[PDB]
Design brief:
monomer; about 200 residues; mainly alpha; 12 helices; about 85% helix; globular; binds magnesium ion; de novo protein; Retroaldolase; monomeric; Retroaldolase 36 (RAD36)
Length: about 200
Amino acid sequence: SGMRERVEEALRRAKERREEIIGKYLEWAKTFANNPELQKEINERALKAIKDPSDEKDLKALGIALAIGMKGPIELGEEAVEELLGLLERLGKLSEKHAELADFLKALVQAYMTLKKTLSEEEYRVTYLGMIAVVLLALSEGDYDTAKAALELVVEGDYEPFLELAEPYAEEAKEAWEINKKLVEYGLKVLEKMKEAIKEVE
Ligand SMILES: [Mg+2]
Ligand SMILES: [Mg+2]
């Protein structure tokens, strides 16, 4: 039970700034879905990151591409998710920086799956928005341990702090799910491209 003070403080500050954080997340996702030049940029920097993780901006692009791509496997169930986690494990064996990214993405997959199998559809989507608000605040400050901690809390079923954060943003949670639907094709393609690139540098 409970959570570390750094995680409590990230939740407190994200709730104070939740109109800003949730609004910026939704608008970035809308811009990405409607701007093909932004999609090409994320994809080419993600491919560079597979060959060389040293630049934080390239590794961020790899994380964004895989966080969008993972929605496919999550909606396909246990076999697809196990294959996706197997791919992340192979990615993590490449270097210590790749391992840090892969460990974060594995926790994000597990958080999604816990929510979907235990909550109603609307509570699932709203809790996810509150969780990602805290995660984005932590990552923007370079605090990767706090970001992963928030995901672990949801894996264990402690959804209530994150649902509570996003309750007044239920409409934005629905719109963020409408936007993911426009990205299904992008995600399937980029996942196949990353899988091929990882095989090449093994
Ligand atoms: Mg290299
Ligand atoms: Mg460099």
